Amino acid sequence: MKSPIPLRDVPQSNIFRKGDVFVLFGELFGRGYANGLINEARDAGMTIVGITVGRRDENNALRALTAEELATAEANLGGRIINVPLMAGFDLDAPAGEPTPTDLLADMTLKSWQDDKLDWAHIEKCRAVGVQRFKDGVAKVMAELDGMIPDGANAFFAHTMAGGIPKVKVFLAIANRIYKGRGERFLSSSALLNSDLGKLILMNFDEVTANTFLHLIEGSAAIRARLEKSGGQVRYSAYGYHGTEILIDDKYQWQTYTSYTQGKAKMRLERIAEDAWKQGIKATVYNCPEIRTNSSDIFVGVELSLFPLLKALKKENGGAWAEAQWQACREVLSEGHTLESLLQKIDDYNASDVMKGFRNFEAWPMPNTAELADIMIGTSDEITKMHKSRDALVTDVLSALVLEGTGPLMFHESSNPAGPVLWLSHDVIAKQLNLMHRLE
């Protein structure tokens, strides 16, 4: 798409009932977006079924879950898990007895990695092996799932797979410089992506973040056909990020965190959904807002996109509950600091020429720049220092709100989806939240 495709209206249909089956195509580890969606499915009475990515034995070989690991995972999910290890990516795949792509990275050093070259023929054979492995795994999982979904049922397949960074000792330092480096510590994301290491990373991103959605849709084709030929509806969802519209000068405007290295893979994901949609398959990528549930992570500055949600809460027929969110956000700031001054900082941030330059949709995802590092990391740090305690941030409150709103939006929109790719920006999130809390 040449521009964002917004979902503006709060969905109000639900076709799912007790006996319908919700399938989590991904494994839950810690809290994130998927929890809210799973909760919506459970509240609607759906049977929850999940996959596992498996674990690794003492020799780093992939294996299924033990009965105890399985019990723990099923307790976490609140549903049955099919114990067939669906590990995405090919970074640890190889023809029998041959080196993995990860093996080929073993000798990369801080000084050598940028110019080190890889054997792309071998890597290609490894990718082929990995793709076939994942396909056979999906076949087994679907063979077992087929009997758990009754004739006449509706099925909701929720894809959550993302990632693909290979294990290599040099990567932590590289990432630290790219994401957090200023001055001489600054490092262009292009330095990584132009290297063979970076090219491998991007290939694996395409496999894990995008192509797994295709493997899900194709692998479940027989099940889909059987359910559709009976009285049922089948849905596929995926989580996307492709920037978010937020209030700048009291107008909703698209922006993004830069540099989002998974961007090309997310656009491939989008195209997979669009193709499927053209084949009559109800697959939808939901492009969700920036969140930062762990402000100790490496992505310094992503949280800057969140703050205008406060204004959105007031704008979209906000009442007492919205005002209570403002109060909650005031309470975590230090003595002497106002919430208004924080929001002012964000106004100045989005008004800057440097940040305006990154509102380029066609160039997305763009490379970072030294100037970007300066203003983004500087602004993020300035706002962090406004707080009484760094374990209780305005961004914790707002991230929680986004998760809360996004669950029902996706769950209900999926009953009657408007299209294959939909943006959930601050406007519809605020509408949903204010609706949910209209009696509080």
- The answer to whether the annotation marks 303 as part of a ligand binding site is no
Instruction: For residue 46, give the 3-state DSSP assignment.
Output: coil
Tokens representing 185 are 């510590």
Residues of the chain with a following break (C to N over 2.5 Å):
none
Q: Crossing angle, helix 320-331 and helix 339-351, to 10 degrees?
A: 90
Spatial CA neighbour of 159 closest among 218, 76, 80, 72: 218
55-56 and 62-63 as β-strands: parallel, antiparallel, unpaired? antiparallel
Domain-embedded: residue 122: yes
- The answer to whether the annotation marks 266 as part of a ligand binding site is yes
- Is residue 287 within 8 A of residue 240, CB to CB? The reply is yes
244-248 and 283-287 as β-strands: parallel, antiparallel, unpaired? unpaired
CA 300 to chain centroid:
17
The torsion angle over the Cα atoms of residues 58, 62, 68 and 70, rounded to 10 degrees, is 170
- The answer to whether the annotation marks 293 as part of a ligand binding site is yes
- 40: CATH: 3.40.50.720
Give the range of the structural domain holding residue 32, as residue numbers without chain letter: 21-299+395-425
Tokens representing 291 are 């969140």
**HSE-up (13 A, CA, CB side) for residue 184:** 0
- Reading phi first (left if > 0) and then psi (alpha if -120 to 50, else beta), residue 385 is in alpha
What does the chain come to in residues? 440
Instruction: For residue 157, give the 3-state DSSP assignment.
Output: strand
Write out the DSSP string of 212-256.
HHHHHHHHTHHHHHHHHHTT--EEEEEEE-S-EEEEETTEEEEE-
Domain-embedded: residue 28: yes
Domain-embedded: residue 337: no
- The answer to whether the annotation marks 74 as part of a ligand binding site is no
Q: Which residues contact 265 (CB under 8 A, 6 or more apart)?
A: 164, 202, 205, 206, 208, 209, 210
Domain-embedded: residue 367: no
- The answer to whether the annotation marks 88 as part of a ligand binding site is yes
Domain-embedded: residue 117: yes
CA 73 vs CA 22, 24, 146: distances in Å:
16, 12, 21
Domain-embedded: residue 83: yes
Rounded CA separation 63/85 (Å): 6
Domain-embedded: residue 229: yes
Domain-embedded: residue 407: yes
Spatial CA neighbour of 15 closest among 419, 409, 281, 412: 412
CA angle 40, 32, 313 (to 5 degrees): 75
Tokens representing 153 are 């049922």
Rounded CA separation 159/149 (Å): 18
Q: Which helix (H) or strand (E) holds 286?
A: strand 283-287
Number of domains in the chain: 1
- Is residue 434 within 8 A of residue 310, CB to CB? The reply is no
Determination technique used: X-ray
List the resolution, Å: 1.6
